[PDB]
Structures are given as C-alpha cells and as structure tokens.
Symmetry: C2
Subunit: 215 residues, 2 copies
C-alpha cells in the first residue's frame, strides 16, 4: 500500500511563506501527513537556490531530483526515483491548503480502480465561451459534468510512467498528469475535493491561502 509522492517544483510562489513555513513546506507536509506516503520526491530546477536552505532539504523522507524542461519531464524523473512504490501521488508545490480527508478519499482509489484519478471540484458559476480571439460571448458552456482539476493526482506508477513517456515523445500538449492518461486513451476518476484547495499563482492568492489555512 506504499505510495511515493512527487512534487514538480520545477520569484516562485512556492517559496513565499505563510506564517511558520513556505507554501512549498505546507504542501509537502500535507502529503507526509498520510501514513501511506513514505517519501516525497521533489523536482527542483538547477538554478533554484532557495530550496537548499529549507529544513526539507535534509528531511530523511525527501529526495530531490533535477527538474527537467517541462512539468512532465520532472514528474518522469520523480517516478524513476520513487524506488519500488507502486502508486504515485503527484502534487503541486503551490497547493498548501490540502486537507487529510480529500487526501484519504483520493488514496482510497488504489483498491477500487486501475486508472487512478484526481481531486476535483464541480463548476458552480455559469460559463461563457468567447468568440475566438474576441472580446465577446459566443455562447454559454454547459457546466453539468464540468470539473475544476485539482491535485494531488494519484496513479499506478507504471501507467503514469507509460502515459508520460508516450506523450512527451509524441510531443503532445500536456497540462496535468491526468491529461497524459487521457491522451493515451485512459479515463481517470474525479474524486470531489474541497474547493479551497487553491493554487497560489497571483499576489492575492497568498492572502487567500493564508485565510484558508487558518480557518
């Protein structure tokens, strides 16, 4: 039942701090919380100097690898260092607000499924599609069965390995890990997660993450 986590961490928002720790430390620590998660593999770009100065740089359950050209190389590098783990948990560096109950709910999949899946949250707003290249609404987009893709993303290590290898080599346009499976013809599951599992991308996200984390 052993699980390796992989964080593609590769002035970056994961090195911003909420209180005690960086966003990167919150995210990582939320994964290490769950007992099935034995190690966390963190991809870091070789330019990155901030990582080495954090306590996580010498934590015994963390391994660092050189991040690659794209998200997907990093993750493949991470998989290759997951040792002997059979399932693999991919998590964004900048998602520090993960709860243990979505995480446990996601981890339940290694016994119910052969594909794996992702945390996600149903879409609530009414969605519009712009006229291509324009300022103007073309039509309303149907939101039933529309989901926000979140992370962690939880998969059989070898399946992940195979879908990523093929999409990188065929030069497919990859966004999340789930999209690499999709590209190879798989259909990973949507596990409903809390909507407060946000990615800190803009200045004001930081205030929000902090709000969410203290709640």
């Amino acid at each position: 039942l052993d699980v390796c986590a992989v964080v593609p961490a590769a002035c970056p928002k994961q090195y911003l701090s909420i209180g005690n720790q960086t966003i990167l430390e919150h995210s990582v620590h939320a994964l290490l919380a769950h007992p099935r998660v034995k190690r966390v593999v963190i991809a870091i770009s070789p330019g990155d100097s901030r990582f080495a100065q954090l306590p996580l740089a010498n934590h015994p359950q963390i391994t660092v690898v050189d991040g690659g050209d794209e998200r997907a190389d990093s993750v493949l590098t991470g998989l290759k260092a997951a040792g002997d783990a059979q399932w693999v948990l991919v998590h964004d560096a900048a998602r520090p607000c993960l709860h243990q109950d979505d995480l446990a709910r996601l981890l339940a999949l290694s016994e119910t499924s052969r594909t794996g899946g992702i945390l996600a949250a149903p879409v609530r707003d009414t969605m519009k599609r712009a006229e291509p290249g324009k300022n103007a609404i073309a039509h309303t987009v149907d939101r039933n069965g529309l989901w926000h893709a979140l992370t962690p993303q939880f998969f059989p290590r070898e399946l992940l390995h195979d879908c990523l290898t093929r999409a990188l080599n065929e030069g497919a346009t990859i966004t999340d890990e789930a999209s690499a499976l999709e590209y190879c013809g798989f259909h990973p599951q949507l596990v409903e997660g809390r909507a407060d599992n946000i990615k800190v991308t803009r200045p004001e996200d930081l205030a929000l993450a902090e709000f969410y984390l203290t709640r």
Copy 2:
C-alpha cells in the same frame, strides 16, 4: 442620458440572500454596492409574494428603492423590474447574493454604455484546468480547453430595450435561460466580456459566507 437603473431578482430553509455578514444581509451589501455608483439612480428589487424577511430591512423604505413582485423564473422577475425602470436607457442586473462587487469593476462595466449597442457582463477568465466527466459517470471524458473560457459574474449591463425583447422572445419561445446575457445569446446577440476581480463571489453554500466576510474586510 447617463442615468442607470438597476434590477435585482430576489426570489427562487433560509434563502441565502438573507444570510448576514456583520450588520447587513447579503442583499443589502449587494444593493449598497450598486447605489454607490453616481449613475445608479435607482434599484428595483424583485421580491416574491409571501416573504416577510424584506419588509424588516432598511430597504423596504429607501428613497431610491422600488419593490416589485417576484415571478416564477429569474427571467420573468427582470421583465417585471424593467417596467419600474423609469426613463433609464440602460439596465444593470445584479445578483442579490453577490455582495463583494467593487467600485472599479462596476465603472469599467458601466463604461460600455459609451461603446456598445449590445452591452456586457463582468467576468473572470478560467485559470484552472477543466475536465468534462463522461455523461452520468464520474471519470474524465477529456480536458476542456480553457482558452476563451470565462466565469460569468454580475452585474450584467444591457440597453433596456434589447434586454426587454430578448428576455421576452426567449421566454415566449421556451429557450433555456440561465443569465441575462444568455437571453441575449439565444436571440443571436454577443455581449461583451468585461474582466472583473475573481473575489466577486456568490454566497450560496454555507462555507461561502466567511469567505465573503474576508473579501468585504479587504
């Protein structure tokens, strides 16, 4: 010439618009965000026949608030509201449950009246990766392209004439109506997407309430 009428559909177990943040209900917070703009000379609130929550708010007697009666759909309500709209050449229709509207977004939207013959809505680009589930199932069909994908927000700002007609023609014809702009779209019209802040949220859920309180304090 530049005077604007605002319409707020307030119908359709506690209704969330009547949840409170500090002093006021959501509705009061929303309506007040409308009243602040110089151009918003009045707000017409559509309230349903048998509701005793409204008359108890400072709003049941504001000099710039007209009440009118609720309808069976959001669409009917607004149509009702436009009759109370006076001599306004443009109508601003806003959710009662969207209390966090900021002034700078509203002035960008109002500006359209100078520029558009269609009008437009506040919106926010989608920044997240979106998935479509297989129908009736809980697995990813595919990734939905977020390029040109936008959250629809309010207010929605339209010329009163065009708003009246497209809402009319869409109800008469049995169109699937979600928001005012979608009454326009069914009628073959293409209203502008005006970007506003993403903290313009809708209070529906229970956890929704504290996030709004946070955003209001900001």
